[PDB]
Amino acid sequence: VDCTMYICGDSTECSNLLLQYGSFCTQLNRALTGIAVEQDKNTQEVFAQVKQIYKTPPIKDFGGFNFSQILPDPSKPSKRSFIEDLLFNKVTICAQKFNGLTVLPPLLTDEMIAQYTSALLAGTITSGWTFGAGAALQIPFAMQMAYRFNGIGVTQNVLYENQKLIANQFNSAIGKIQDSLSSALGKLQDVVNQNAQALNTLVKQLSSNFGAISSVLNDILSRLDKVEAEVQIDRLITGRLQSLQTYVTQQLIRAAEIRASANLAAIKMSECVLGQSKRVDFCGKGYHLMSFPQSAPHGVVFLHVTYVPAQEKNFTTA
Amino acid sequence: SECVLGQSKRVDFCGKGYHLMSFPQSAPHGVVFLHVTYVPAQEKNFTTAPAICHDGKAHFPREGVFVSNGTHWFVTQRNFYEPQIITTDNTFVSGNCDVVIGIVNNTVYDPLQPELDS
Amino acid sequence: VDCTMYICGDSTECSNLLLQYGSFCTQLNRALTGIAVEQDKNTQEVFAQ
Amino acid sequence: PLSETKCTLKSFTVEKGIYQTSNFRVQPTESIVRFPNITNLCPFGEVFNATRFASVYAWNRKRISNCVADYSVLYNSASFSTFKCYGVSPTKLNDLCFTNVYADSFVIRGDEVRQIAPGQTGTIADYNYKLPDDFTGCVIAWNSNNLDSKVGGNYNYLYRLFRKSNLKPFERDISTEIYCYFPLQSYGFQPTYGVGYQPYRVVVLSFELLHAPATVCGPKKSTNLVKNKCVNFNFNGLTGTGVLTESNKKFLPFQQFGRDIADTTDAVRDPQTLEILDITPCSFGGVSVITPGTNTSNQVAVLYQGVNCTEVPGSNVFQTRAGCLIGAEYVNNSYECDIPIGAGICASYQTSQSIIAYTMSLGAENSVAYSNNSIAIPTNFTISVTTEILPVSMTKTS
Ligand SMILES: *[C@@H]1O[C@H](CO[C@@H]2O[C@@H](C)[C@@H](O)[C@@H](O)[C@@H]2O)[C@@H](O[C@@H]2O[C@H](CO)[C@@H](O)[C@H](O)[C@H]2NC(C)=O)[C@H](O)[C@H]1NC(C)=O
Ligand SMILES: *[C@@H]1O[C@H](CO)[C@@H](O[C@@H]2O[C@H](CO)[C@@H](O)[C@H](O)[C@H]2NC(C)=O)[C@H](O)[C@H]1NC(C)=O
Ligand SMILES: *[C@@H]1O[C@H](CO)[C@@H](O[C@@H]2O[C@H](CO)[C@@H](O)[C@H](O)[C@H]2NC(C)=O)[C@H](O)[C@H]1NC(C)=O
Ligand SMILES: *[C@@H]1O[C@H](CO)[C@@H](O[C@@H]2O[C@H](CO)[C@@H](O)[C@H](O)[C@H]2NC(C)=O)[C@H](O)[C@H]1NC(C)=O
Ligand SMILES: *[C@@H]1O[C@H](CO)[C@@H](O[C@@H]2O[C@H](CO)[C@@H](O)[C@H](O)[C@H]2NC(C)=O)[C@H](O)[C@H]1NC(C)=O
Ligand SMILES: *[C@@H]1O[C@H](CO)[C@@H](O)[C@H](O)[C@H]1NC(C)=O
Ligand SMILES: *[C@@H]1O[C@H](CO)[C@@H](O)[C@H](O)[C@H]1NC(C)=O
Ligand SMILES: *[C@@H]1O[C@H](CO)[C@@H](O)[C@H](O)[C@H]1NC(C)=O
Ligand SMILES: *[C@@H]1O[C@H](CO)[C@@H](O)[C@H](O)[C@H]1NC(C)=O
Ligand SMILES: *[C@@H]1O[C@H](CO)[C@@H](O)[C@H](O)[C@H]1NC(C)=O
């Protein structure tokens, strides 16, 4: 926000009055800039956990597991997956722009974020957890799944002996995720709603008189002489500056909430995508096998894959 | 707690690589954790298979991975190439050979055999 | 908090004066309602596992 | 730009970074004026130079409208004595247009004149003429002891002495039923009275500034109109700075202005050609100075945020999606991000040295050579010791 263009606009007369309050516009601009740099920090620490941009092979022989909905779509230049396209459609200015408010582009583009998710997913399916520790050591996919099973205390023969069933279950579950997202993204939507609603409030507070004869500052400057105008303009300045301080304080608290959510997502990226988790319910319900990251507008979707026990029988035990 | 008072299984929580241990150092207004981690190096390609078919039994590794050097099959630990002969003591049987995609044929040694022979 | 009953109380005269400040009472009640819904969310996510 | 960063950072060294310094704003090439084209001079003469005034209980509202005024005649001629203008300045009054003007006229004691202001009480205010709390207008009055008295007394100037309740603002009540007393009483005016008991003629010009087309305006003369160019303007008093554009907004024949969510005026009807014009503002944005560290170089590049490179008033000029970048050269190579400009572009000091701007590399690109029967196993290790620094406390203050 250009604090001077918000409070005073084009008027030099108001700008001279506003200077008598000193640093407050600098404090406001500095706070909003700090929030803005933190949004690039948040995206960097969530998505840029991978050292190299891994590419998947041309032959997708992953043992019956069909990642086509979550790997990059070859038919588009945007390099988003099918599910990432579903996610972007399932969330996605003049009045703000003209009144001193400006919205800055993110440093990483959506294509760059999709290129990091592509690298993370390619590394995962080609090399398992090894690309998090060090080099991407290739291993056949059924064997990394067999060591996921061994991690959850299920002996790896259970994987190989039931492999075609496990592949069919996985493929089917991805299909249900596709249909669910085609029918879902409340947390991301709420953040966009709150920020748009806060800006609409900040703009509409320009209509408020705050006790002055008018809210339109060029009325007063077309209509009262200086010493009488200065009282009216000091009323407008006071109330507009209090509207700005309210906006920037609520943005500092929203910034902390999103910062916490970005820290959590960076932990989930490390512990569920770059690794297998022994932490209960941290990577979905059931015993964690693996997770896949997908980009979403302003956020991340983790597709958590978990082993859920079924068809139990009673036995006498000793 | 989780890096100094303990060893962490949590990936990237106590540095890059597999966590061994960490050391705390004081700093002005804050703390420096020196994180010590094992980072794997100098990897080699090997042919691999999920199971060995022997006498119609499917053998699986107990605590390792099956690899081959171009002529012979070995069992080795996943994170450091220490090749060992495939034996009844480092493999376990489950079922016949037909159910596993990609089973390979090699002998599985029984140490009781040459002992009974001697 | 009813921002109007807090600032003005029964007075219509004060209420008309207060309207000249515009959205501020709506912002306040909206913030306190968001805080309120978050407390049910906190209890839900802790106990309804 | 480097001096401007030094001065906004309040420091003689500047460290490597991108710093928002100041805001760019394009400026008005000329000051348009557009007004009603009304020739009829306003008939204020037949109030200030009426022979005999009304009684203040029966104060008379002459409507003045569809005319051109000049209140500097009424003011600067200064035969008057009091000229209190409420809600409008006596001077800017000549620069403004009004929807109607109502001239309210009466005679009272030079003492009781002090009651005729918005938010007042007393004999005249309570029962004869009440000015509203949000009144816009000028109370003009002058001594009339030359006309409104005589030896043996004048008795022409009645005022209401009693009412069952005070007047509402601008209420007129000429009723005469007995209140016991007759409800009216009159000033006995004699020449020999002191300054406060002598008669004074009062004319109160009640202006109004409604959304209607203004029918009274001051003497200023309209200019020509220019378009697709930045200008200052006055349109019947609507004043601002903007790039007047031929509007396709379909105003209905009664409408005169169109408005933004902030109640800035978004479009205006021309007061003479009656066409509709958009008033999008003359363009603006933040200015950020990309700088290497001042211990490296004084050479700097400047980003005009959101501004299009056609607009900024130069050996290299590049249009990022973040804005126009001047003084850094776009190189088709890609590197690690040094100073973040935005939208995939970063800038760095590189070779003969200058500021390059470039698309950042996310990392080196690798194909993992996955195969259904190939595994890689490490034959060695390295022991890595890495530092993680965390804040724990901050300086305790009271
Ligand atoms: C490991 O091997 C890969 C090649 O894959 C192997 O050979 C195939 C023919 C097939 O038998 C697979 O099952 C094997 O896994 C090596 O990758 C290639 O390396 C060369 C340089 O020597 C490079 O020019 C190629 O581009 C690489 N291939 C691809 C697809 O990019 C890899 O170098 C070997 N790694 C180690 C550590 O030995
Ligand atoms: C992976 O799954 C997709 C479906 O999600 C399969 O896509 C089909 O591919 C064939 C050609 O091989 C087409 O004729 C079908 O129309 C495709 N179906 C859809 C719904 O797109 C794909 O074949 C699968 N691949 C593997 C290796 O399992
Ligand atoms: C694979 O490893 C085995 C060792 O386990 C190699 O076999 C030995 O080869 C040497 C000659 O190079 C002989 O002297 C030994 O007697 C062999 N031992 C056994 C048990 O056969 C084998 O050569 C290796 N293959 C390759 C291609 O390197
Ligand atoms: C792996 O070993 C088994 C034996 O343990 C092979 O199976 C035999 O194959 C022959 C034909 O080549 C049949 O006549 C026998 O009846 C099979 N025996 C059994 C027990 O099924 C198998 O073919 C070998 N496979 C490879 C690829 O070498
Ligand atoms: C920068 O501004 C120019 C206008 O000065 C834009 O040019 C117009 O672009 C549209 C398409 O978007 C064309 O239909 C017009 O004919 C163009 N006008 C002229 C005079 O060339 C240009 O698109 C802007 N570019 C950016 C990146 O903002
Ligand atoms: C590996 O893939 C090839 C086809 O490219 C197939 O013929 C072979 O049987 C596969 N090997 C295993 C172990 O699945
Ligand atoms: C009143 O009339 C006299 C001429 O008799 C003139 O000088 C004066 O300006 C007039 N005043 C107004 C307010 O019209
Ligand atoms: C006002 O001026 C316009 C030309 O700009 C002219 O067409 C119009 O007739 C004038 N108004 C009147 C009432 O004559
Ligand atoms: C300035 O740069 C030189 C290298 O050119 C370096 O030796 C010196 O320490 C730097 N000074 C500071 C204060 O960074
Ligand atoms: C960058 O590449 C484009 C083609 O994509 C070319 O036209 C342009 O001249 C190149 N610029 C430089 C500085 O190399």
XYZ file of C-alpha atoms in Angstrom, chain D residues 33-291:
259
model
C -12.408 23.538 -16.677
C -15.923 22.587 -17.835
C -18.959 24.456 -16.511
C -22.625 25.164 -17.340
C -22.930 27.593 -20.276
C -25.372 29.942 -18.545
C -25.339 33.688 -19.341
C -28.066 34.952 -16.950
C -26.512 36.994 -14.099
C -28.086 36.020 -10.788
C -30.758 38.501 -9.444
C -29.244 39.101 -5.998
C -29.809 42.824 -6.518
C -33.509 42.515 -5.683
C -32.634 41.222 -2.195
C -29.644 43.369 -1.167
C -31.323 46.455 -2.723
C -34.987 45.800 -1.983
C -36.633 48.949 -0.605
C -38.332 47.420 2.473
C -37.523 44.049 4.081
C -39.814 41.424 5.617
C -40.350 40.944 9.337
C -38.128 38.153 10.678
C -41.166 36.136 11.817
C -42.148 36.166 8.104
C -38.663 35.698 6.578
C -38.697 35.467 2.777
C -36.909 32.761 0.697
C -36.113 34.040 -2.820
C -35.039 31.072 -4.961
C -31.983 31.862 -7.115
C -31.384 29.317 -9.905
C -30.369 28.821 -13.563
C -28.064 31.840 -13.313
C -24.381 32.836 -13.157
C -23.261 34.422 -9.870
C -20.269 36.438 -8.690
C -19.987 36.416 -4.901
C -16.777 38.465 -4.982
C -19.104 41.378 -5.778
C -21.173 40.581 -2.686
C -18.056 40.119 -0.505
C -15.151 42.354 -1.563
C -17.392 45.425 -2.028
C -17.469 45.318 1.798
C -20.273 47.817 2.409
C -21.363 44.947 4.713
C -20.097 44.164 8.219
C -20.638 40.429 8.932
C -20.225 37.702 6.319
C -20.021 34.343 8.130
C -19.798 31.515 5.562
C -20.498 28.048 6.988
C -19.446 24.884 5.157
C -18.100 26.958 2.236
C -15.258 29.446 2.125
C -16.050 33.059 1.142
C -13.272 32.852 -1.458
C -13.673 29.388 -2.994
C -17.365 30.307 -3.232
C -16.530 31.913 -6.598
C -14.962 28.646 -7.849
C -17.966 26.381 -7.178
C -21.421 25.497 -8.578
C -24.627 24.958 -6.599
C -27.808 23.052 -7.423
C -30.000 25.842 -6.061
C -29.419 28.910 -3.922
C -32.053 30.183 -1.489
C -31.771 33.793 -0.270
C -33.411 34.185 3.154
C -34.064 37.803 4.133
C -35.052 39.671 7.330
C -34.167 42.525 9.743
C -33.079 42.159 13.407
C -31.195 43.847 16.262
C -27.418 44.025 15.941
C -27.280 42.149 19.250
C -29.591 39.324 18.182
C -27.624 38.834 14.920
C -25.254 36.691 17.010
C -28.007 34.026 17.243
C -28.080 33.373 13.447
C -25.481 30.627 13.114
C -25.860 26.846 12.874
C -26.338 25.302 16.309
C -27.714 28.337 18.174
C -30.625 29.384 20.413
C -32.435 32.592 21.376
C -35.332 34.837 20.368
C -34.572 34.743 16.644
C -33.141 31.225 16.485
C -35.943 29.700 18.584
C -39.026 31.314 17.033
C -38.046 33.156 13.836
C -35.198 31.595 11.794
C -33.263 28.408 12.642
C -30.103 27.325 10.733
C -29.603 23.528 10.451
C -26.648 21.695 11.975
C -25.237 20.838 8.504
C -26.065 24.201 6.867
C -24.003 25.302 3.852
C -24.219 29.037 3.271
C -23.224 32.609 4.064
C -24.895 34.861 6.656
C -24.494 38.371 5.184
C -25.669 41.396 7.192
C -25.154 45.164 7.334
C -26.307 48.203 9.320
C -29.638 49.671 8.168
C -30.257 52.402 10.788
C -30.462 54.748 7.767
C -33.685 53.065 6.579
C -35.153 50.794 9.254
C -35.730 53.322 12.086
C -37.276 56.726 12.649
C -37.611 59.410 15.314
C -40.729 58.497 17.261
C -39.942 54.897 16.280
C -40.296 52.518 13.385
C -42.574 49.541 14.102
C -42.325 47.648 10.761
C -40.181 44.713 12.025
C -42.218 42.073 13.871
C -40.734 38.981 15.507
C -42.462 35.988 17.088
C -42.243 36.277 20.885
C -44.039 33.003 21.796
C -44.438 29.514 20.356
C -45.604 26.191 21.801
C -42.230 24.736 20.730
C -39.078 25.997 19.017
C -38.837 26.173 15.217
C -37.490 23.338 13.135
C -34.626 24.398 10.813
C -35.911 26.610 7.961
C -39.452 26.357 9.403
C -41.733 29.260 8.418
C -44.716 30.109 10.659
C -46.732 33.297 9.977
C -49.700 32.282 12.210
C -51.295 34.943 14.465
C -53.761 33.113 16.775
C -53.524 34.247 20.414
C -51.060 32.289 22.579
C -52.776 35.317 27.066
C -50.852 37.235 24.383
C -50.731 38.015 20.707
C -47.801 35.787 19.638
C -45.923 38.505 17.681
C -44.125 41.600 18.994
C -42.252 44.344 17.102
C -38.958 46.246 17.320
C -39.443 49.872 18.221
C -36.442 51.258 16.275
C -35.142 54.793 16.893
C -31.944 56.340 15.421
C -30.457 57.276 18.814
C -30.038 53.614 19.867
C -26.633 52.071 20.504
C -24.870 49.762 18.058
C -26.612 46.618 19.355
C -30.211 47.899 19.321
C -30.051 49.503 15.848
C -31.535 47.566 12.884
C -29.419 45.397 10.578
C -30.564 43.877 7.283
C -29.704 40.177 6.911
C -29.562 38.053 3.756
C -28.646 34.392 4.334
C -27.611 32.524 1.169
C -28.542 28.872 1.804
C -26.520 26.944 -0.795
C -27.173 23.307 -1.680
C -24.811 20.800 -3.323
C -27.024 17.875 -4.378
C -26.365 15.175 -7.006
C -28.536 17.170 -9.466
C -26.995 19.191 -12.327
C -25.857 22.428 -10.709
C -27.873 25.423 -11.926
C -25.980 28.315 -10.261
C -22.257 28.695 -10.873
C -19.511 31.249 -10.348
C -17.859 33.279 -13.096
C -15.034 30.934 -14.277
C -14.906 30.179 -18.013
C -14.711 26.637 -19.413
C -11.651 25.371 -21.308
C -11.468 22.997 -24.245
C -11.363 19.228 -23.557
C -8.456 16.816 -24.210
C -8.507 13.030 -24.069
C -6.277 9.944 -23.815
C -3.906 12.270 -21.949
C -3.436 13.127 -18.272
C -5.097 16.343 -17.056
C -6.278 18.202 -14.030
C -9.971 19.002 -14.248
C -12.918 20.876 -12.802
C -16.366 19.658 -13.920
C -19.097 21.759 -12.245
C -16.839 21.509 -9.177
C -15.882 17.845 -9.551
C -12.110 18.231 -9.253
C -9.286 15.752 -9.716
C -6.492 14.383 -11.907
C -7.155 11.739 -14.551
C -6.866 10.381 -18.088
C -10.221 11.443 -19.530
C -11.368 8.715 -21.928
C -14.477 8.514 -24.102
C -16.786 6.345 -21.993
C -18.970 3.521 -23.264
C -20.826 3.586 -19.918
C -24.521 3.935 -20.772
C -25.612 6.791 -18.455
C -29.347 7.364 -18.211
C -30.293 10.960 -19.148
C -30.674 12.133 -15.512
C -27.295 10.836 -14.285
C -24.322 13.204 -13.986
C -21.564 11.187 -12.252
C -20.539 7.574 -11.824
C -18.795 6.205 -8.772
C -16.113 3.822 -7.505
C -16.392 1.624 -4.403
C -14.335 4.290 -2.588
C -16.745 7.007 -3.834
C -14.124 8.389 -6.139
C -15.896 9.470 -9.330
C -15.368 6.854 -12.027
C -17.044 8.624 -14.976
C -18.480 12.085 -15.648
C -20.968 13.658 -18.057
C -19.492 16.623 -19.905
C -21.544 19.665 -18.852
C -21.787 21.068 -22.401
C -21.433 18.237 -24.933
C -23.299 15.904 -22.509
C -21.035 12.969 -23.500
C -19.802 10.497 -20.838
C -16.075 10.346 -19.968
C -14.146 7.761 -17.938
C -11.792 9.103 -15.253
C -9.297 6.299 -14.743
C -6.359 7.797 -12.785
C -3.011 8.789 -14.269
C -0.742 5.816 -13.675
C 1.410 5.090 -10.634
C 3.446 2.434 -8.853
C 6.284 1.749 -6.472
C 9.897 2.331 -7.512
C 12.354 -0.334 -6.321
C 16.107 0.124 -6.749
C 17.983 -3.095 -7.422
C 21.453 -2.615 -5.988
